[PDB]
Amino acid sequence: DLSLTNSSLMPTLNPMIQQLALAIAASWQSLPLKPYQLPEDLGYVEGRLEGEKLVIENRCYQTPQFRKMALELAKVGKGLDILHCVMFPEPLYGLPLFGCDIVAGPGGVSAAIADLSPTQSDRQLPAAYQKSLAELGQPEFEQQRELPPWGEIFSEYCLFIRPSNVTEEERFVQRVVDFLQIHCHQSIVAEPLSEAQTLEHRQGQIHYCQQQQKNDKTRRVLEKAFGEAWAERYMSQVLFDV
Ligand SMILES: C=CC1=C(C)/C(=C/c2[nH]c(/C=C3N=C(/C=C4\NC(=O)C(C)=C4C=C)C(C)=C\3CCC(=O)O)c(CCC(=O)O)c2C)NC1=O
Numbered sequence: 504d505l506s507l508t509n510s511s512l513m514p515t516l517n518p519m520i521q522q523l524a525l526a527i528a529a530s531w532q533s534l535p536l537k538p539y540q541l542p543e544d545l546g547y548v549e550g551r552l553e554g555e556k557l558v559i560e561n562r563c564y565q566t567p568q569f570r571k572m573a574l575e576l577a578k579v580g581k582g583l584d585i586l587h588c589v590m591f592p593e594p595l596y597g598l599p600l601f602g603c604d605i606v607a608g609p610g611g612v613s614a615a616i617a618d619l620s621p622t623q624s625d626r627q628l629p630a631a632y633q634k635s636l637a638e639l640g641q642p643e644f645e646q647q648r649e650l651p652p653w654g655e656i657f658s659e660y661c662l663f664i665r666p667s668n669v670t671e672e673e674r675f676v677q678r679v680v681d682f683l684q685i686h687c688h689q690s691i692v693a694e695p696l697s698e699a700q701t702l703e704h705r706q707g708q709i710h711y712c713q714q715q716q717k718n719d720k721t722r723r724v725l726e727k728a729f730g731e732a733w734a735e736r737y738m739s740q741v742l743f744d745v
């Protein structure tokens with residue numbers, strides 16, 4: 504569950520990943536949650552082929568506003584830690600997609616990505632999100648990274664950095680906390696939408712999932728531990744279900 508106290512991975516994960524896992528779990532803990540059963544009621548899985556083992560712990564929930572809320576923690580061998588999180592919105596409410604991805608090795612966090620990604624056909628976040636996000640101001644990060652082409656799905660507020668030091672790690676986690684606070688508040692005040700608008704949002708979410716499946720960084724990690732067929736099933740059915 505969301506206490507993370509019974510997580511076997513948590514104690515061994517990069518400190519920034521631990522703090523973000525805790526912050527996400529804390530944001531969700533008091534919501535009107537129900538379990539969301541992944542395919543094959545997946546929770547914990549491990550695999551190895553010719554190289555290192557991959558271990559994944561899945562936690563997934565749902566609420567009336569969020570069709571699927573996934574928090575995945577993973578580790579490859581002793582050298583690679585990953586946090587994956589997506590809140591998939593119920594299209595009826597027109598909310599954007601919260602996502603984040605953190606990858607860390609022995610040298611520290613290599614990649615930290617977080618966004619509230621659009622679902623509208625105009626590729627804009629709803630007005631209330633634009634207002635609240637603008638008020639946070641532009642955060643300063645020394646080592647920004649450019650998104651790959653499939654990353655056109657992310658908003659103009661997307662963070663994609665290599666944190667340079669602890670100050671930046673903590674600044675990133677705080678900005679994710681800020682995104683979550685905005686998002687959970689907007690989920691309370693969101694107007695239920697028309698059938699045509701609901702359809703528009705559904706389309707946006709489908710596109711998001713299809714584009715995320717183009718990420719060969721995820722796919723290679725899965726393939727090296729479980730093979731091509733397993734990775735394709737995992738990405739298309741577990742992570743980014745259409
Ligand atoms: C669950 C298993 C899972 C694995 C194995 C995983 C691996 C993974 N994701 C990565 C990058 C990345 N990951 C993302 C983004 C995301 N990815 C997401 O799953 C979500 C929700 C977003 C954004 C909200 C982006 C944009 C990159 C950079 C891709 C690139 O450099 O080509 C990288 C490369 C890190 C680096 O270049 O420093 C790895 C190894 N991510 C995972 O989530």
Ligand SMILES: [Cl-]
Pocket residue numbers: 651652653654717
């Ligand atoms: Cl691409």
Ligand SMILES: [Cl-]
Pocket residue numbers: 719720723
């Ligand atoms: Cl690659």
Ligand SMILES: [Cl-]
Pocket residue numbers: none
């Ligand atoms: Cl390799």
